[PDB]
Amino acid sequence: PSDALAALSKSTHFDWVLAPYDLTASRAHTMVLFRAGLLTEEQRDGLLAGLDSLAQDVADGSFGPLVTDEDVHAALERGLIDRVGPDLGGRLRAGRSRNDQVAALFRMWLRDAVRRVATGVLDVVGALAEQAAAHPSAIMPGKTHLQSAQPILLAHHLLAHAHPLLRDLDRIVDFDKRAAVSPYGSGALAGSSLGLDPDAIAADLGFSAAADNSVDATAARDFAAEAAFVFAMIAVDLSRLAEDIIVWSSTEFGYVTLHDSWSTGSSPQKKNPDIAELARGKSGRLIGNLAGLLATLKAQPLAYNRDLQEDKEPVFDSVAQLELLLPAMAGLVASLTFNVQRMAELAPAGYTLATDLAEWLVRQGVPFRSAHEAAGAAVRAAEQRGVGLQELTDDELAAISPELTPQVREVLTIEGSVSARDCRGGTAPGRVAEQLNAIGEAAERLRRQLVR
Amino acid sequence: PSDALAALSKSTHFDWVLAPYDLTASRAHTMVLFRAGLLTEEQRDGLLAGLDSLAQDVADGSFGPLVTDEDVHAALERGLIDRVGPDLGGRLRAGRSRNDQVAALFRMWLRDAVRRVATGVLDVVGALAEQAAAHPSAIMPGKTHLQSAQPILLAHHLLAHAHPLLRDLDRIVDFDKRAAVSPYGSGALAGSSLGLDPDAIAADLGFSAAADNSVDATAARDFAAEAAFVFAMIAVDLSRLAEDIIVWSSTEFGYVTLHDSWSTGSSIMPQKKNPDIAELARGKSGRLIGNLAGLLATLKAQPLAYNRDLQEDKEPVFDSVAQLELLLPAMAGLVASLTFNVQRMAELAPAGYTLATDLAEWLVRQGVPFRSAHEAAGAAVRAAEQRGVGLQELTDDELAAISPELTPQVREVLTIEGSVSARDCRGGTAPGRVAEQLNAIGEAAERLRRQLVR
Amino acid sequence: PSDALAALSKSTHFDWVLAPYDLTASRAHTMVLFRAGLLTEEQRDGLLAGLDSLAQDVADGSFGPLVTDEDVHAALERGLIDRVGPDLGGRLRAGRSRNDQVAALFRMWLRDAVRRVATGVLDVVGALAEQAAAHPSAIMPGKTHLQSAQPILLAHHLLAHAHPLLRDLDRIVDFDKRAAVSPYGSGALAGSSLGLDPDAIAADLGFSAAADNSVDATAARDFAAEAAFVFAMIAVDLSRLAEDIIVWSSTEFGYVTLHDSWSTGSSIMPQKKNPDIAELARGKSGRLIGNLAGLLATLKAQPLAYNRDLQEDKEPVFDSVAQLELLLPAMAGLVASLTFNVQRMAELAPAGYTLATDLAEWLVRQGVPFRSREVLTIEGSVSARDCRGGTAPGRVAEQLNAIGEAAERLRRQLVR
Amino acid sequence: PSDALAALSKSTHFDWVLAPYDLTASRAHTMVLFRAGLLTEEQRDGLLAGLDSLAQDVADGSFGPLVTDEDVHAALERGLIDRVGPDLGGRLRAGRSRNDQVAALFRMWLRDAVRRVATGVLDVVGALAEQAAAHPSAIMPGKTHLQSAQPILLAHHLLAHAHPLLRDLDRIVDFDKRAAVSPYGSGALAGSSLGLDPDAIAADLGFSAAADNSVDATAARDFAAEAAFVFAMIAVDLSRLAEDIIVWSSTEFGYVTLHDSWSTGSSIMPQKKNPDIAELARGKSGRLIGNLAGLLATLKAQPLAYNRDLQEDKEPVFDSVAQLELLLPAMAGLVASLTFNVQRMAELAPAGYTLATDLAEWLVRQGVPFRSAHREVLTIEGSVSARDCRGGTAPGRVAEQLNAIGEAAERLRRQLVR
Numbered sequence A: 001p002s003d004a005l006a007a008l009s010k011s012t013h014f015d016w017v018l019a020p021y022d023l024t025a026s027r028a029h030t031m032v033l034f035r036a037g038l039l040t041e042e043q044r045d046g047l048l049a050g051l052d053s054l055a056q057d058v059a060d061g062s063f064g065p066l067v068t069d070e071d072v073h074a075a076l077e078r079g080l081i082d083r084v085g086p087d088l089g090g091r092l093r094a095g096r097s098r099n100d101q102v103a104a105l106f107r108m109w110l111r112d113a114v115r116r117v118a119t120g121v122l123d124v125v126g127a128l129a130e131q132a133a134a135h136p137s138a139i140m141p142g143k144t145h146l147q148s149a150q151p152i153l154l155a156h157h158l159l160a161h162a163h164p165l166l167r168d169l170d171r172i173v174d175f176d177k178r179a180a181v182s183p184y185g186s187g188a189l190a191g192s193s194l195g196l197d198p199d200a201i202a203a204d205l206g207f208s209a210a211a212d213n214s215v216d217a218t219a220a221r222d223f224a225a226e227a228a229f230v231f232a233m234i235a236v237d238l239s240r241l242a243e244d245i246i247v248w249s250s251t252e253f254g255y256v257t258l259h260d261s262w263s264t265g266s267s268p269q270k271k272n273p274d275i276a277e278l279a280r281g282k283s284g285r286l287i288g289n290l291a292g293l294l295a296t297l298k299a300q301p302l303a304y305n306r307d308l309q310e311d312k313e314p315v316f317d318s319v320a321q322l323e324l325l326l327p328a329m330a331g332l333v334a335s336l337t338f339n340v341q342r343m344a345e346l347a348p349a350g351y352t353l354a355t356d357l358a359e360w361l362v363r364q365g366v367p368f369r370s371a372h373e374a375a376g377a378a379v380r381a382a383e384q385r386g387v388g389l390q391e392l393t394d395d396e397l398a399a400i401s402p403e404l405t406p407q408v409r410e411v412l413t414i415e416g417s418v419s420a421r422d423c424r425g426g427t428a429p430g431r432v433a434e435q436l437n438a439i440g441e442a443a444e445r446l447r448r449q450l451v452r
Numbered sequence B: 001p002s003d004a005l006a007a008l009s010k011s012t013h014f015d016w017v018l019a020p021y022d023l024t025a026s027r028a029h030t031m032v033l034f035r036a037g038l039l040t041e042e043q044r045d046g047l048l049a050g051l052d053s054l055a056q057d058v059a060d061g062s063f064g065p066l067v068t069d070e071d072v073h074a075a076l077e078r079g080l081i082d083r084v085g086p087d088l089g090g091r092l093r094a095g096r097s098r099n100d101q102v103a104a105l106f107r108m109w110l111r112d113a114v115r116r117v118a119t120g121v122l123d124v125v126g127a128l129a130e131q132a133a134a135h136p137s138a139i140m141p142g143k144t145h146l147q148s149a150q151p152i153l154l155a156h157h158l159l160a161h162a163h164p165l166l167r168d169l170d171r172i173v174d175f176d177k178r179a180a181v182s183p184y185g186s187g188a189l190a191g192s193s194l195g196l197d198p199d200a201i202a203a204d205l206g207f208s209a210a211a212d213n214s215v216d217a218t219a220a221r222d223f224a225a226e227a228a229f230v231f232a233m234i235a236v237d238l239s240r241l242a243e244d245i246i247v248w249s250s251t252e253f254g255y256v257t258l259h260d261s262w263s264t265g266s267s268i269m270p271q272k273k274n275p276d277i278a279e280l281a282r283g284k285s286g287r288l289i290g291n292l293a294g295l296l297a298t299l300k301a302q303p304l305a306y307n308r309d310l311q312e313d314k315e316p317v318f319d320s321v322a323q324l325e326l327l328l329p330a331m332a333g334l335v336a337s338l339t340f341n342v343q344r345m346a347e348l349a350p351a352g353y354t355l356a357t358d359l360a361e362w363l364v365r366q367g368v369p370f371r372s373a374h375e376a377a378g379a380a381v382r383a384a385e386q387r388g389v390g391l392q393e394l395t396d397d398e399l400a401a402i403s404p405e406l407t408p409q410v411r412e413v414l415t416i417e418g419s420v421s422a423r424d425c426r427g428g429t430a431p432g433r434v435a436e437q438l439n440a441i442g443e444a445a446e447r448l449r450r451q452l453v454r
Numbered sequence C: 001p002s003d004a005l006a007a008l009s010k011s012t013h014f015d016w017v018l019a020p021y022d023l024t025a026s027r028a029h030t031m032v033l034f035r036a037g038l039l040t041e042e043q044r045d046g047l048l049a050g051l052d053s054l055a056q057d058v059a060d061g062s063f064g065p066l067v068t069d070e071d072v073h074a075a076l077e078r079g080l081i082d083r084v085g086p087d088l089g090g091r092l093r094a095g096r097s098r099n100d101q102v103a104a105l106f107r108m109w110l111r112d113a114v115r116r117v118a119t120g121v122l123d124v125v126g127a128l129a130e131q132a133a134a135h136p137s138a139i140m141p142g143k144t145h146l147q148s149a150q151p152i153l154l155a156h157h158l159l160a161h162a163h164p165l166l167r168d169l170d171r172i173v174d175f176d177k178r179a180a181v182s183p184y185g186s187g188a189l190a191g192s193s194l195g196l197d198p199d200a201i202a203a204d205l206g207f208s209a210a211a212d213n214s215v216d217a218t219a220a221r222d223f224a225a226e227a228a229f230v231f232a233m234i235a236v237d238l239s240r241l242a243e244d245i246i247v248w249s250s251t252e253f254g255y256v257t258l259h260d261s262w263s264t265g266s267s268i269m270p271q272k273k274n275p276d277i278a279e280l281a282r283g284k285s286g287r288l289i290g291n292l293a294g295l296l297a298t299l300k301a302q303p304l305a306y307n308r309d310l311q312e313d314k315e316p317v318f319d320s321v322a323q324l325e326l327l328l329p330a331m332a333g334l335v336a337s338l339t340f341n342v343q344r345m346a347e348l349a350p351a352g353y354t355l356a357t358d359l360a361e362w363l364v365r366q367g368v369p370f371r372s373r374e375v376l377t378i379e380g381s382v383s384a385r386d387c388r389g390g391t392a393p394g395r396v397a398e399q400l401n402a403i404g405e406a407a408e409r410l411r412r413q414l415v416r
Numbered sequence D: 001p002s003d004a005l006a007a008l009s010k011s012t013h014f015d016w017v018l019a020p021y022d023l024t025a026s027r028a029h030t031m032v033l034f035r036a037g038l039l040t041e042e043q044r045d046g047l048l049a050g051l052d053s054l055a056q057d058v059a060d061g062s063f064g065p066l067v068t069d070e071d072v073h074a075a076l077e078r079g080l081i082d083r084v085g086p087d088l089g090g091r092l093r094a095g096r097s098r099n100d101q102v103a104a105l106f107r108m109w110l111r112d113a114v115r116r117v118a119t120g121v122l123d124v125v126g127a128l129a130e131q132a133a134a135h136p137s138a139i140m141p142g143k144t145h146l147q148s149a150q151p152i153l154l155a156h157h158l159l160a161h162a163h164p165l166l167r168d169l170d171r172i173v174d175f176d177k178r179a180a181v182s183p184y185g186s187g188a189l190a191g192s193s194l195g196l197d198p199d200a201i202a203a204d205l206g207f208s209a210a211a212d213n214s215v216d217a218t219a220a221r222d223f224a225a226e227a228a229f230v231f232a233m234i235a236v237d238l239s240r241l242a243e244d245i246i247v248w249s250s251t252e253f254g255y256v257t258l259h260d261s262w263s264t265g266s267s268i269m270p271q272k273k274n275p276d277i278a279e280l281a282r283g284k285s286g287r288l289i290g291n292l293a294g295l296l297a298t299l300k301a302q303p304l305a306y307n308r309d310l311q312e313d314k315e316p317v318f319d320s321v322a323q324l325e326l327l328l329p330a331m332a333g334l335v336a337s338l339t340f341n342v343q344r345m346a347e348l349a350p351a352g353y354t355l356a357t358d359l360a361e362w363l364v365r366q367g368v369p370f371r372s373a374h375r376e377v378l379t380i381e382g383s384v385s386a387r388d389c390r391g392g393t394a395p396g397r398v399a400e401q402l403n404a405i406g407e408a409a410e411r412l413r414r415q416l417v418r
């Protein structure tokens, strides 16, 4: 190998994190070979003992890759040959290739990683759930187009960010079932002539089944693309929550005060929401890793091509980011203080209660279009006097619609507004309470589905 | 409203496809408002009748958007008012918004669209399986790094493009569970003061459930983004099959001959016969990867709840669907139409000494340690190569020099037919295993199909 | 050809837009064939007249593609042949391919497009500079992390969105050089044995030069890719302006008040006034990055020379261009029509002790190392920042003026 | 600062490569503070001497960041405050933010980076050019759709990968002009109260001009998005070469044989020589497409001025550059190492009846109309020779192509040196 080629081909700086899985795989692979009659017991136990030794020296950082190691696979054979002979050491590559090996290890790594990610997603859900639970009554101006639209419970807004994250958990569970198929046994592409047992080693390493096609099992990286999708969808959902927090932390909003432990200053007297901003900017990053991996998987002729080595770094970088991001966001969310007096004073500002007036008129029998019309004449009636809709006189109420009567006042508060909306998925506290329970059960239900 | 404003906001050129869905939804919501006491029976049956009338005039092309119309939503209410007057038709607005209306229409539209997409995937899977079945014995050099590695059955190679596409159907089924939550009754964002029933209208419209959070049901577009992923992935899986066909179709390879009906000619070169279907699919895989990235970018950093940005969710998904709707049957037809030159694939199958692995595995069966069987194989390859013969034609002395363990019984494994048959484990290229693999593909497709009908 | 192949191969539905470029190039090719002694004057004039008829009828809506026309090129040959006969109509096709042809028509289209985009980009710059000129001294809280940081002049903030666009305009000038190379006369991929002339036809069709490599000029699509990036970059530049407008317009900020004619409402909440223009701009920049990414994936791993794949060059560039063609004037209209709430901005400018930094920077001018009343006013504070590019009014008026001169200089180079 | 917050905020694992540049600029900033009478000479020399000691300790590597250093900026302040004490090291802080510094530093870093990238591109053109030179007359079947279309010179095909790369070089020059604008002294966002001089420090630091708008200079990241585009276009350009090479190397093609030193093999298949470099080129174009698209997604919808998001500008660009720095010398090498099997290519050149176009083109010169048309030029040598216009595959034409490539390459090389 030339200089340039070694530098390009060298992968130990990112793939070393596969080492432990490579050893566990090799150990179960030893058993398959011995059970097919291709190793003496003693050749078996020699390798078992060389490997346990090598897992030890790896775990504590005593064995590491040399500069002259191309990849995790070559380096652990340096260290295994060091431990048992070259003759015994080399027996271990019978009936497997670097191709089925790498795919499998990458799957075992990633099946753990989604669970680590899953742990973090539940943190943020629990953190949002907690905050919503501690504010069962705080009313804000609910937004569409960032304009005051209707008053809602802070809790209902807040849980609207938990619901997507749970769907992401649902996706992890969906992903992991496709993830749990082992290519160990496929060798380079066609299988082995030797008498191995793909199903046994698949059981050992903890997959659900072995692949039905050796070519497909070594070539396809759709499982990696799907993971990459799922991690991007999580980061994008954090980006939505981050946008909210950032804007909420502004001097102009003043909805939240940031905690010092979860905020940052400047090189003078600023409290910035760095964590939220980094979640946001990183969502862009993890869209890149996904888009780029698909581009890489594109137009790949069967079977394995070296191109496919590029599957890992994108997924690795995606999983790392979320491993930093989720605990931070959960912390940041947990640490938020809400300025409830500030949120409520705004809740009706912009005459958000106009729609309650129009819906009131529908209940008396006015066609929506005309009630909508009447609501607007009243918004102007109120606006021009610096007053709230509730404070319109009976007479000026009577001028807008004869159907408008003093009893409509009894629905022009933000408290009554939020409460009227008690259909499934509405912002009435009774519904938010049930919604909050459902999240509890979905979280737990999903957690258990992952433990299996 | 200014022309500029109005020209940008106008969405009828793409969103007119949701019109049946809109009309159907308004039928269910007519019934919801009635059950809550907010229409007399008169008014109910007047709306029902006017929606029915409007529905037929849309279906056949008498009613269509005008330039005045901002969205299909504006369009249908124009012509509903025309059919039943301004008093009664304007009542339909009660308890709902464009925000919930549109999330639920695009959902409805999409569930059908993956169903159609799924039918097309199933086709391609069907054409791969059929050719696999028709050529159960054809042997080829299997490739890695597009270099000949070990012999494989064409059937085996073919079916490897089926399993990804069955995983994408799986992904479709998974997607649809999440797609089946209705936003109706969420109104602009908070839900409604009126006494509607979201569960009822959810059931009426084919959904499995109503949403648990109005703000979320109206703001979230993760289902759309997911849709785009499944399509993207389906297009990339098609790109893989595409690359192979294109390569196989070269003069150099000569693995397949393209059919006239499934290939295109040149406008200055008389005798060119190109694989354009494969090539367009490869091309459009980039395209559909863009629509997904772009979609997720648009979803990035949305503050809750609805924002006009979310309009941009439909076009990329529509595009990805329309391209798959073209591409799938075309590739199924392409695959089905191919002729395989089995003599060409076979003469190349042992070439570059692909049976080396077989030789070395044979020594491993005699108890020779693999790294040593490797070196002996390598040595056997050169021994034959310089003489320009097959491994089989290594003479007994030649074989004995390479290794004392290597006796002339090795010679009865150095055939492409033996090589291929020896891989009898689950997954392998042996014909008994391909036969089972082909049954599984059959059962899995049926199973996947039946859960899409539910 | 099967039904499915015909449905898949057909591109008339989007490439029709190249029809008039195809005719201008057929005219120029007629001359190239004629000059090389491959046409009589009778034949030449027969073709020129047929091409003129067709062209007049194409612009009329009298002539359009048909269901069984595969592309713009087939469609137009059919119509020339109706007009001038199958014999004389046969001759144009000589020495030329769909490959060199389609690549060249697309370049000519892309070069008019980028100018239309340049016009709209300038308008937004102009809309931005008009508003600056109309608020020359107003002071706002200057933001980073969307947190109040230092006071700045509104004009400074507004022009901070113009420079990005001036730089995008710069990119269009750069692009256009790489763009102005003609593939005409490279045929399929190798050139023609017929005695054509790339240079003459290049010059006839407004290009700076003919291509130096026939294989490369028919295969390469990096010009398309560069266009997608520049348009994607314009959309994101727009999207940063969009985010500021949207937030500015919230009840909570009340920095600006949207104008009735440039905002839309709500079907149920009467009184809404949404910045739909800003919001669509923001959303569409996503779409347009997506167009870029996807175009690059299409180009990736493409063996030479031409592949059917390279038909996907067009539609994404077409969409980007269409979107910017809608977005650009809308956003300029949104920006011209804002009302700025100057007083509400002046209240908040000192809010959060943004003037702390001005105190600490007074400690420095009086000895003490960077630790911690003439400059504890927002007027004094902004006036202190009078180096180049700072917020001082002196510099903003010179900057506002430089913007005017940069804009026109970049305008000059597009007409050339 | 919570553990979580610090974990996330930490930048020293990637932004430490900005340390040399950070130091070079603090030097030029000590001068700016001094010329405005905000430093004494004994102070000014204290710092310069302190910013000298710290530059050497960074260079040989005795000074690096601690676990607690948020970033390269903090780290270098800590090291300076260690060398010249807390009081003096603090003065250097005045009239600058982390905002304008990182903008500037990244640009300095990037201008260096594109120069290194450009050198590798030139290497890859050189390689291609060399192989044309060595195969001046070899004829192969020219392909469109990977179907044999018309015969061309191998030289004509090879060089067709060179023009793209030259155009990418052209984009680098065009890029560099926008890159060469300094934000120094624009501050957090508003410019500085203190009498600094942006134009002078820009010049100290090798920039061409100081920025016209302080909000813009500190918040805009289009320069980074341009760079990412250019890198991703280069990588896509390389993947098109890479695809050719991979397909050529197949047994079926036999167009090229791979070299052992620019080849990799199999742990379980002795005969195997693979095109791993080509294949990693290909795979990594996907990756660099990713970094561009993501970066743009990151820059999308940023309100003015600086936001923490903008920290994400560096890692994807660092990565893209990192990858081309490994892939350019490896590809140039792969290309130079290759054995072209000219006999094999020549056999195939007329295969598929590729000389039919020539047939039709001859009877066109016999007055027959083309569209009906479908031995001097029924040879591949005659066929390629006839295509003698600018751009064609005619021998004397490729030779002129090839000398134009060498000149354009050096012309473009000159402009990077300015």
Ligand SMILES: N/C(=N\CCC[C@H](N)C(=O)O)N[C@H](CC(=O)O)C(=O)O
Pocket (backbone or CB within 6 Å): A011, A071, A097, A098, A099, A102, A188, A304, A306, A308, A309, A310, B144, B145, B149, D265, D266, D267, D268, D269, D272, D274
């Ligand atoms: N080399 C190879 N696969 C790559 C090993 C794993 C690689 N580092 C990756 O990450 O994809 N494939 C075999 C050779 C082998 O088994 O080592 C081939 O098909 O030639």
Ligand SMILES: N/C(=N\CCC[C@H](N)C(=O)O)N[C@H](CC(=O)O)C(=O)O
Pocket (backbone or CB within 6 Å): A144, A145, A149, B011, B071, B097, B098, B099, B102, B188, B306, B307, B308, B309, B310, B311, B312, C265, C266, C267, C268, C269, C272, C274
């Ligand atoms: N107008 C609006 N959304 C439009 C939905 C249809 C649009 N084509 C889309 O799909 O985004 N939102 C409401 C107004 C309304 O309820 O009509 C708002 O909150 O202001």
Ligand SMILES: N/C(=N\CCC[C@H](N)C(=O)O)N[C@H](CC(=O)O)C(=O)O
Pocket (backbone or CB within 6 Å): B265, B266, B267, B268, B269, B272, B274, C011, C015, C071, C097, C098, C099, C102, C188, C306, C308, C310, C311, C312, C314, D144, D145, D149
């Ligand atoms: N399909 C094709 N040429 C380009 C068609 C242009 C296409 N519609 C597009 O828009 O890119 N085939 C050429 C021959 C030709 O038709 O000119 C070939 O096989 O080399």
Ligand SMILES: NC(=[NH2+])NCCC[C@H](N)C(=O)O
Pocket (backbone or CB within 6 Å): A266, D011, D071, D098, D099, D102, D306, D308, D310, D311, D312
């Ligand atoms: N306000 C700030 N914290 N600015 C820090 C600038 C450096 C930051 N790590 C970046 O690269 O963007």
Ligand SMILES: O=C(O)/C=C/C(=O)O
Pocket (backbone or CB within 6 Å): A265, A266, A267, A270, A272, C144, C145, C149, D096, D097, D098, D099, D188, D306
């Ligand atoms: O620390 C800085 O220089 C900037 C901080 C900020 O803009 O918040």
